[PDB]
Amino acid sequence: PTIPQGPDDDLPAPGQQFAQFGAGCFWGVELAFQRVPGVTKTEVGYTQGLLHNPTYEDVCTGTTNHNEVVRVQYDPKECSFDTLIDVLWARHDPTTLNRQGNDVGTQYRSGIYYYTPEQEKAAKESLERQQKLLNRKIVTEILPAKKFYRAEEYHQQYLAKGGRFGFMQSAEKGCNDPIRCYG
Secondary structure, three states: OOOOOOOOOOOOOOOOOEEEEEEEHHHHHHHHHHHHOOOEEEEEEOOOOOOOOOOOOHHHOOOOOHHHHHEEEEEEOOOOOOHHHHHHHHHOOOOOOOEEEEEEHHHOOOEEOOOHHHHHHHHHHHHHHHHOOOOOOOOOOEEEOOOOOEEHHHHOOHHHHHHOOOOOOOOOOOOHHHHHHHO
């Protein structure tokens, strides 16, 4: 109904700003942002769908239309929204519709969900610059941010915790070690 269709009424920490990005399986996407200087908090969850308080099992069915996203809290004085957008372009292929890698489904779609008109404009202009670099058309959706449902704790900072195989991937700021999808 309208609850999940409502806005994100959560307030970030003082002096911080919220940002939301969808770029496929949220594990790798979260790790990418954890390494960005200026990012003070990261968390994965579900949003843009039609089901209130969804579980991972619900989203997995692909019938909720929710997208797996990372909600980022960043300090605008230390990290610009543009820098975050650049991280997005470098973390995934923004030209595949409703899929990322071998993860197929609407819950893996590319998207930038803005909290302000400033973010919307920045996202649209950044997409134009990025597009001139890619052959395929960018399908990333730029829409207003909506209610964010934080995912189960076992999904949070999953790769840094060890991933599927036990090999922890570092979340230290400035780390450029290639991010591996599931572990």
